[model samples]
Target: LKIGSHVSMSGKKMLLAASEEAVSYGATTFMIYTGAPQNTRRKPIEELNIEAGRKHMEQNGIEEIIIHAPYIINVGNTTKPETFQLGVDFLRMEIERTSALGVAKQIVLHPGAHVGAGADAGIQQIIKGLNEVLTPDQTVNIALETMAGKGTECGRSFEEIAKIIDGVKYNEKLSVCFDTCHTHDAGYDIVNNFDGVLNEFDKIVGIDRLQVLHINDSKNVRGAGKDRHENIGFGHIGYKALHHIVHHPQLTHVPKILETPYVGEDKKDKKPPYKLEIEMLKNGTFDEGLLEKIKAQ
Candidate 1:
């Protein structure tokens, strides 16, 4: 039920500032990137510059905090052995940092592209990569994110993700993050058949492993095979689709994070998207018949 979006941590001083900004707009949760995209290694936890975020969260009652992994990580690729190894090391370091910061869960990954190899090969490679990084002692849970089936990207389907989980040598701490835009792009008609989509997800990954929801409206059409995020209710997936997603009984327990675009002069206008999405969610625009639903519940 906690809704938030990804915030940038450009400097050590921006953490609390960003957190306060998000809370002011109506975010119950927040997602942050610890480092820049090109940085293969994670920065030291002490250097994270999150004091302001901590203070804001402490004061304003925002509890949920999630950290997205680096954008360059492609765990499913075997072509670059060095990059793969570096990614694994980076991930382990990230776990340590997040745990130290008291952040409960970090993204597992997008599971990357398979290059020339087939989907089966990519899934196996991803599983191996994850097992190499995750040890039994690590406390943070890495939640694998769903991807749009653009290029050779893996984890576009629930079945593919399930296969990766099954192939993993260890499963004790693994989890899944479902992205609405990605799911829609991957050819699942979650907007029209929300119940059916949930059923499929439960069958493939199980309801228990579902931990996070990246709530975004898709800019592309269903099965467009693209990964574009638009502001909530302003994109292809529309308000009704998101309404079904937010109100779904199965997803109620998961923390929903917004990855939508903001409508400002620059990308810095993070407040608009967060505010609009939160307002839409809180009001009954998406859930017009909420009273009846509540009565049934």
Candidate 2:
């Protein structure tokens, strides 16, 4: 299983720290942000510890990793020129950084919200922003993520995602990151109709464009339009369905990532549930007391 979880990339060691966390969970692959997902502050390229980090990953059997662009870059804002410009410029720089990291060729990005610009205009803005950002010289691919239909978020459906891709000049550089929680919340019946959903995605967005899988269980029921991520077997998308999706014959080469919430009562005391969850999925069995077991640690 080319399975892993979202790992940290903070501290002096950066990639080394992130690789160590992934290894602790016995993961073969993992995902990371260049820095915190919320802000724009970044360590200079010279100080990112890429050499040491890549060395660690190479030695530890981590063959591939996914880079998630910071959440602040929303290129879909057609109304605000400053925000749209910011999104365009920041995304270009981020693509450069992703290339610099050299961990993988694809960087996962949230296909931003419209903020009242409506879906059609927002998609047009995204296509324009992507055209402005992408060039033939760049090697990295921007994998637009599937999002829950919260607020006026774009890319909530495969058809919407296809529209953005269709309008982009450099559509070859674009791909899709399928998030389980997002799609589930957005009203795809993945749990009961896995192949049916895959077929629809294939028909609308092409299956080959699928690059990354965010293997999250949703807190809300199907069609809730909420993007809350729950732990492995504890959510509406249960362990069996997730396991089936993870081991599907068609997506064997894709890297599956866990973005579930940490298990704990207090904010500071929370623990990541990757190790146990990974083991559960790998073993094809769910422990009913998984949360309690994590809390016991």
Candidate 3:
């Protein structure tokens, strides 16, 4: 598995600065938000100075780089047509910008919220929004992120996500992103029953469509319906649970990005949480004898 952390690419520090810091902590992969905080205004993707980052990773031997889209986009909004159109246009622009950087295939986005339109209607709206934005010129694979069932947010369940995929005209270029915290809060008991969770996911959306995994421990309990994230092994999703996930055969090749909470002398210090999680996975604390089992495989 390629392990990494979520970072800010368009911040005071350059993209390479943030990425290099993550690499220093033993990260073979990294994730970045392509825009500013809240995503109210757009920043040209070129301004991220990714050329330096690309060269740095190539020189230092990092394996993967993933980009998360703006947080403000809602493709499932049905009450406002103009606003929805603006969102579609924004997504198109985002895709074009990423493609220009030669990193379009890494972009990911939240599926969207229903806002009282109901789950089925919201799924259709997400598909419609995606169809409008997608073009032959676009080369990136857009990933629809799963969410906790907080508020009227859609894409909380695998079935819902599958419906959204089925509605889309260009299904081949679309993929699913599963968030550990979100899935747990949405009532999928992955911590206690990892195999059961995988089986359910396979039945609903098929394993081949899953490309990204957000490895975060939930701050809330099962069925809490909240989106709060916590440090790895220190919250609702115990260390054992994440270990099972990291070693799962199905996720071995996928990018595992951490969205866990960070705290330290510098707010940018994301190493502690990531290191602790990786150590736990590397050692045999989470799963007894699983390491030898995996090594033999």
Candidate 4:
């Protein structure tokens, strides 16, 4: 299983710390923000311990680590020109940082919400912003994440993402992140029609454009349009479907990164649900008491 979870780039060691955390979970891949996801503040590239982290990954047999563009970046915001420009600038900087980290191939990004602007207009603006940011010099590819259609978020459907790709001047620099939770909540029926959905994606978005997978279970029912992610096997999407998706033959090449919620009621007791979850997925068995076991530990 090419599986892992979102890890932290925290404290002094940064990527080295992230690598340690991911390896502890027996992960083959992982994802991280360059810094805090909600803020623009960043540590210098030299200070991120990229060399040591890459060395650690080499030792552990981790082929790749993914970067998630911060949630604050909304290049689709047609309402404010300055805000759109800020997103473009930050994204460009993030691309540079990702390149410096030595994983210049893919950066998973949330296709921004249209806000009050209609979907068509929002997609056009996003295309424009991407054109401005993408250049011949950079090798980084932006993997636009599939959204849950919560509010006016773009890229809920494969068609929307396809449109953006079609419009961008540097379409080669564009790709897709197939987020299981978001797609479920947006309503493609992965539980009953996994192959059908994959076929649809292959037809509309081109399966080759699928660069990453955000392997999360959904808190909401199918077509709910809400974006809350639940722990594996404990939510509406269920273990059977998610497990199949994770182990699917067609998707084996991509990284399966978990973004499941923590398992405790209080912050002090809170713990990541990944270690046991990864084990269960790897073994093709669901632990009925997974959450309880984590809490006890």
Candidate 5:
């Protein structure tokens, strides 16, 4: 089981910075954003320091990384013609950027909301956008993230993703990233019944399509439709089930990442949290042990 966390790719060294951070955290796998998820600002594909990053990963033995699309990618919101097109265009560019990086080409994506267009229409638009964005020649495989059943958000179920995959010309190029928190919020009982839930997923979307996981503990109850994330073992989902996920025989090859609340050094520094999270996860230690260590420090 390759355990890791999402690391920052912003700042000067770009991919190299992301790689170093992951290595420092003792991660064998990690996730990165090519650009900020909130906007379209991006350096050209050539500008990212992929060579240095590739070397670092190779030298340090970190393997199996994934990339997440910017949150601004909303290919389903077809209310305005430009709105949908902008998302599709940015996705195409993201794939291109990911392609240049010499890692396994899997991009985790959240199929955005339909606005007021309704579910069927939104799913159709997402299918159309995917067909337009993906090509047979492209090496980057898109993995649609499991949604949290939030307002208008698509891809909340295996059925939804299965439908989209069936429509795409390059179906094999598309896959799924199962977010535990999102799955719980979307009403799958992964916490208490991990096996049954996975069995249900296998029937809806073939079990093989599961590529990676966003192994977060959710802050809300099951079927809440709220997308709040909490720390592992500290939320409603709890750590026992999450532990099952990381050690499951079927999921051994899948990389599980914690997008949980980052534990900051002091009280004030609020940034993208990963380092300590990674260390604890990789070491399979948490809470009491972590707190004791912190107090000793």
Candidate 6:
């Protein structure tokens, strides 16, 4: 059971700090962005100590982890020519960075909102961008995250996601990351109808395409189309359903990650509370005390 939270990329150690933070909490797998996700101004890509990061993982028990793409890269937005081109160039740069790292395999991308470009046009732009970014022999899996249908977000529905994947020339390098909150907020009803949603994903997107799972609880109600991620057992999706997701036979091999808010568990504002959440998820133990402790006040 590979389970962890997104590690804060703090300190001069870079990737090794991410591993150290996650492992400090008994996490075996973790997620990290190589640099600030919203900005292109970064330490030169070659300076990233990926080899040192690998060696740190070898020293610790940490495993190959998830790589997240920059949040600002909107591959679907064709409205602004520079914005679109920046997306293409940045994603290609991002892809190359992950390829250089060579330890972890998949990079999660939030399929950008169409932003008044219309859904079909947005998907087309994303497909075009992907074709330009991915090579046939590319080792990294660009995992398109399923989005909540906020405004013009493109990957809100499985059908829409499938369209983007189908349109791309290098679909082999493409994969999917099913976010629990995003899917539920998109109206898939993972709380009450987990199996149905999984079955549908298998039918529409192909089960094999599921390379990563974002384990989260929804802050808003289902069908809200809000992308807020609550703590593991504290939000609308509840513990039992999330527990099912972690322990479910279907997803045993898939790496699960927490994007919920986290600070050190001792901190007063430890909102997403990964230390407690990760322990509960990995142990598969739920009780009245656990529920009462994390319940919304």
Top lDDT hit: 4
- The RMSD of every model to the true structure, in order and in angstroms, is 5.7, 1.1, 5.5, 1.1, 2.1, 2.8
Candidate 2 ranges with C-alpha deviation above 4 Å: 266-268
Model 4 worst lDDT run, 10 consecutive residues: 102-111
Candidate 4 lDDT score relative to the true structure:
0.91
lDDT of each: 0.77, 0.90, 0.78, 0.91, 0.83, 0.83
- Residues 130-164, candidate 3, lDDT per residue (tens digit)? 99987655578888888899998888889888898
On residues 233-277, what C-alpha lDDT tens digit does candidate 5 reach at each position? 778887678777877888888888878775545875554445555
lDDT per residue for candidate 4 within 1-297, as digits (tens), equals 788999999868899899999999899989999999997788888889999999999999887888999988899999899989999999988998999988637888888889998999999999999999998667888999999999999999999999999999889888899999999999999998988999999999999999999989999999999999999999999999999999999998988999999889866679888999999888888899999887866
Error of 2 at 37 (Å): 0.4
**Which pairs clash (backbone N, Cα, C closer than 3 Å) in model 1?**
12-49, 16-52, 16-53, 108-143
Question: What stretches of model 3 exceed 4 Å from their correct place?
Answer: 10-13, 264-272, 286-297
Query: Which ranges of candidate 6 are over 4 A from the true structure?
Result: 263-272, 287-297
Against the true structure, what is each candidate's TM-score?
Answer: 0.90, 0.98, 0.89, 0.97, 0.93, 0.93
Candidate 2 structure, TM-score to reference: 0.98
TM-score of 5: 0.93
Candidate 1 lDDT score relative to the true structure:
0.77
lDDT of 6 by residue, 161-261 (tens): 99999998889999999999999999988998899999999999999999899999889999999898877777899889999998889888899998885
Better of 2 and 5 by TM-score: 2
Candidate 3 residue 258 Cα shift, in angstroms, is 0.5
Residue runs of model 1 more than 4 Å from their true location after superposition? 50-52, 264-272, 286-297
